[PDB]
């Protein structure tokens, strides 16, 4: 894992996150791609940004943590772009994805738990 891919989830929190991602795909509460993710942030509709630690060169993602801090949106890195893209429901790598808001789903409540876990990593 690239040391700039911080905070970084373990394999267990990773599976949890990817499960939430796959729920979001099914609910159509998911945007894939770094620029697609940026756009959700600037609209104020992201609930969670997930990035891949094995994105090379990782520099192309590094504006995203800063944007998320500006917008008060949680983010995390998972170790593998291949696994992230599987979770997103596509057969290609995904280096960043964004869960978007929906007031009638359980996603926000799961993200709240995930945030607590990420904060325990810190």
């Amino acid at each position: 894992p690239n040391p700039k891919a911080f905070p970084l989830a373990d394999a267990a929190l990773t599976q949890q996150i990817l499960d939430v991602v796959q729920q979001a795909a099914n609910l159509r509460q998911l945007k894939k791609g770094a620029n697609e993710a940026t756009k959700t942030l600037n609209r104020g509709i992201s609930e969670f940004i997930i990035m891949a630690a094995d994105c090379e060169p990782i520099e192309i993602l590094l504006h995203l943590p800063l944007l998320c801090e500006d917008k008060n949106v949680p983010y995390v890195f998972v170790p593998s772009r291949v696994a992230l893209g599987r979770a997103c429901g596509v057969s290609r790598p995904v280096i960043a994805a964004s869960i978007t808001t929906n007031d009638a789903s359980a996603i926000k409540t799961q993200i709240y738990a995930v945030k607590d876990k990420i904060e325990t990593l810190l």
Binding site: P3, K4, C68, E69, D70, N72, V73, I118, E119
Partner: peptide, 27 residues
């Protein structure tokens, strides 16, 4: 390398202040 250690440190501080469920307590 020292660049990356500082990046991590600053990311930690800003996650606690700007994003955390318990950010008031971290503030």
């Amino acid at each position: 390398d020292e660049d990356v250690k500082k990046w991590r440190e600053e990311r930690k501080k800003m996650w606690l202040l700007k994003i955390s469920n318990n950010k008031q307590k971290h503030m």
